Amino acid sequence: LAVATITQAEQQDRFLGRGELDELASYFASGAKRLEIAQLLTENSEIIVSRAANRIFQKIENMAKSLRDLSWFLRYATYAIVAGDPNIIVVNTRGLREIIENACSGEATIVALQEIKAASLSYFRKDPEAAEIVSQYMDVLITEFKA
Amino acid sequence: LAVATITQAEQQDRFLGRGELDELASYFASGAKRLEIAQLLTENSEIIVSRAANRIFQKIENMAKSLRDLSWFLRYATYAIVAGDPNIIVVNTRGLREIIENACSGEATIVALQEIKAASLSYFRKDPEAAEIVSQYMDVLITEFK
Numbered sequence: 196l197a198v199a200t201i202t203q204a205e206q207q208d209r210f211l212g213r214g215e216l217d218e219l220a221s222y223f224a225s226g227a228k229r230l231e232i233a234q235l236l237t238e239n240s241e242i243i244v245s246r247a248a249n250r251i252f253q254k255i256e257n258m259a260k261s262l263r264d265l266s267w268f269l270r271y272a273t274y275a276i277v278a279g280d281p282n283i284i285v286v287n288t289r290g291l292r293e294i295i296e297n298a299c300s301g302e303a304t305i306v307a308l309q310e311i312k313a314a315s316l317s318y319f320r321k322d323p324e325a326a327e328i329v330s331q332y333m334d335v336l337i338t339e340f341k342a
Numbered sequence: 343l344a345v346a347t348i349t350q351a352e353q354q355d356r357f358l359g360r361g362e363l364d365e366l367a368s369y370f371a372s373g374a375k376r377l378e379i380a381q382l383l384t385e386n387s388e389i390i391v392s393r394a395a396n397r398i399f400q401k402i403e404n405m406a407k408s409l410r411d412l413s414w415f416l417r418y419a420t421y422a423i424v425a426g427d428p429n430i431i432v433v434n435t436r437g438l439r440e441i442i443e444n445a446c447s448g449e450a451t452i453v454a455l456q457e458i459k460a461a462s463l464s465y466f467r468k469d470p471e472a473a474e475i476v477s478q479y480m481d482v483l484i485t486e487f488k
């Protein structure tokens with residue numbers, strides 16, 4: 196964050212670098228777009244989740260938890276997008292591969308997640324900038340289940 | 343702020359509400375303007391600092407330390423502006439007036455700080471919002487010195 200960047204600059208007795216400034220400038224300026232994205236994923240959260248669950252419907256034994264988890268995945272994506280901090284996804288998906296490996300099916304989860312991503316993207320057809328943001332964050336989520 | 347309202351929604355296992363989204367909208371917009379300001383001040387810092395030194399050059403007995411401090415002051419102003427937190431200035435200015443009244447002239451430092459302000463402001467004559475933002479942070483710098 197800003198307070199982060201400032202702390203290290205201070206630590207090194209210096210002005211923020213041109214790069215640090217540009218990076219913060221871009222973080223603030225993409226803010227409106229990131230909020231637009233979150234508002235949209237949120238209001239459509241239920242349709243996005245049910246599309247993902249449906250795609251693996253026949254693989255699911257625990258539908259209540261499946262629907263819950265898929266909603267939670269999308270909710271943390273949504274946090275990360277609002278904060279402009281992909282690490283929110285990383286911290287909160289820590290260890291989930293093992294847990295869901297064991298709980299149901301790793302294969303299926305990735306299938307559902309890919310549908311979370313596709314269904315999410317579907318709301319930004321006209322808006323390449325947003326689609327990129329959405330794909331970047333969704334890819335961070337999925338990758339935490341791949342390698 | 344980013345982490346704060348997200349932390350709450352997180353604790354309550356929910357999506358951010360529309361009211362939360364609008365509040366962040368205001369945060370990011372202001373941050374954008376603050377960052378534009380900080381970039382200008384940073385890129386033109388040598389110029390700003392030299393104007394301020396030059397404005398009191400007759401009183402300066404140590405050009406080096408004077409140029410250093412004025413830069414140090416400007417630096418902390420930019421930190422405050424970037425974070426949007428005037429208290430960065432307050433905290434790092436604490437007790438400084440005494441150290442510097444000793445070292446040279448408290449009063450010349452004030453004149454030079456007014457020139458830091460006046461010089462900083464010259465980059466924002468087309469943008470009265472940004473100008474007011476620079477004036478408000480610089481005033482905290484000058485005041486907490488006095």
Ligand SMILES: CCC1=C(C)/C(=C/C2=NC(=C\c3[nH]c(/C=C4\NC(=O)[C@H](C)[C@H]4CC)c(C)c3CCC(=O)O)/C(CCC(=O)O)=C2C)NC1=O
Pocket residue numbers: 254255257260261262264265267268271287288291294295298299300303304307
């Ligand atoms: C990133 C945010 C986040 C997620 C997603 C999360 C998931 C998560 N899923 C869990 C269990 C589970 N998850 C599922 C199933 C599924 N899960 C899926 O994402 C699939 C759609 C489906 C497998 C097909 C099942 C069947 C269990 C354990 C069932 C139980 O004993 O109740 C558990 C173990 C504790 C619990 O049962 O609640 C966690 C922590 N925790 C988090 O903080």
Ligand SMILES: CCC1=C(C)/C(=C/C2=NC(=C\c3[nH]c(/C=C4\NC(=O)[C@H](C)[C@H]4CC)c(C)c3CCC(=O)O)/C(CCC(=O)O)=C2C)NC1=O
Pocket residue numbers: 401402403404407408409411412414415418434435438441442445446447450451454
């Ligand atoms: C907000 C960030 C910040 C500032 C500004 C700061 C100033 C500061 N100026 C100092 C000294 C000094 N400062 C100056 C001069 C001046 N100082 C001025 O701001 C005037 C423009 C000019 C007098 C006209 C002089 C001559 C010394 C004594 C250093 C020496 O004797 O070599 C000292 C004493 C220790 C040192 O020499 O490093 C500090 C701590 N410290 C900080 O953490």
